[PDB]
Amino acid sequence: EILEKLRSIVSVGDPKKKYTRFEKIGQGASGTVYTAMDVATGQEVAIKQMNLQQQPKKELIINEILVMRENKNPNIVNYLDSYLVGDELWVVMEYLAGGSLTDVVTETCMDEGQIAAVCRECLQALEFLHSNQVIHRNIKSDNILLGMDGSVKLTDFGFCAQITPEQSKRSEMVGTPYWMAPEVVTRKAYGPKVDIWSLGIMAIEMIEGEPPYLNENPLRALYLIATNGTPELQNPEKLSAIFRDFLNRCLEMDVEKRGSAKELLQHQFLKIAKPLSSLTPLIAAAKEATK
Ligand SMILES: N[C@H]1CC[C@@H](CNc2nccc(Nc3ncc(C4CC4)s3)n2)C[C@@H]1c1cccc(Cl)c1
Numbered sequence: 001e002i003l004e005k006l007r008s009i010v011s012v013g014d015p016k017k018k019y020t021r022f023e024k025i026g027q028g029a030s031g032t033v034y035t036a037m038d039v040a041t042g043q044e045v046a047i048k049q050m051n052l053q054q055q056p057k058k059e060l061i062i063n064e065i066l067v068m069r070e071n072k073n074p075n076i077v078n079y080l081d082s083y084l085v086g087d088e089l090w091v092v093m094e095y096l097a098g099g100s101l102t103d104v105v106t107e108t109c110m111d112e113g114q115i116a117a118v119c120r121e122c123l124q125a126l127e128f129l130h131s132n133q134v135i136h137r138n139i140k141s142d143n144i145l146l147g148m149d150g151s152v153k154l155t156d157f158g159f160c161a162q163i164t165p166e167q168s169k170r171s172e173m174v175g176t177p178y179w180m181a182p183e184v185v186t187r188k189a190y191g192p193k194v195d196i197w198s199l200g201i202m203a204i205e206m207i208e209g210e211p212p213y214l215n216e217n218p219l220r221a222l223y224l225i226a227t228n229g230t231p232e233l234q235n236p237e238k239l240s241a242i243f244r245d246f247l248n249r250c251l252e253m254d255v256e257k258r259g260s261a262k263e264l265l266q267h268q269f270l271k272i273a274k275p276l277s278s279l280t281p282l283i284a285a286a287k288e289a290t291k
Helices: 003-009 059-070 101-107 112-131 194-208 218-228 241-250 268-272 276-289
Strands: 019-026 032-038 044-051 079-085 088-094 098-100 144-147 152-154
Touching (some): 003 079, 019 044, 059 088, 098 276, 101 194, 101 276, 112 152, 112 241, 112 268, 112 276, 144 276, 194 241
Antiparallel strands (some): 019 032, 032 044, 044 088, 098 144
């Protein structure tokens, strides 16, 4: 009954009177997401509402709130507060007007400059987390949020892990199959570089619209990751050499040879990044496409 630890972390007081103008903007396995407005303050917020029954290990909920409140950063969606509403947990975060990267990758064609701009900002989030001994473990386009200024922010700490010098590696088979690094899929001990792999897969989303093997069922994709290793692009000839190089460094099978987030921030690919204002036309296109 670590529900007591969860009960001591959360704020008390009715969120249903602190916040108004509730609108469902999202579903998800982890719960439903609503927008709302702080009754007093006017601030727009996103609230994730999670059924405590839905989650069998309430230990992960605790971990999610702590990591988020302890690791604030400009490239991470800001945690504001949390509340228990009966058997439902509400997490309140800053609302980022814009959209999901998923909408952009499925509905637009991104140029290398735009892709490099997104990758740089995500690598900055990862550098910060990994330096704070946190592995995200669920990097994908669905967890990247884009601001109306082209701000890029990472969210979702539902699956993350804290490591320590004593225990530098994890062994849970956690993530979303198509984005999971081979060492994770094959139950080897793994470290922060699983996030770099997932980032590589997200770069393939930005190129091709989908992670490798998405037409296949999840179990089949796990088999394909275990057997193929480094995925191949549909049309690699369409990419610059330096982009292909960046991809190769993100998607190295040899963990020790795979780029760290720090190493990758100095890659040549990132030097072609467009300014973040370059992403706002993608956001406009995606909103129009998903009317
Ligand atoms: N699957 C994802 C789809 C995209 C986004 C919802 N859609 C949307 N659309 C337009 C603006 C906007 N802005 C937001 N600012 C702050 C937000 C915090 C994350 C809540 S969201 N979100 C989030 C959602 C998500 C993230 C993490 C866990 C789960 Cl379970 C679900």
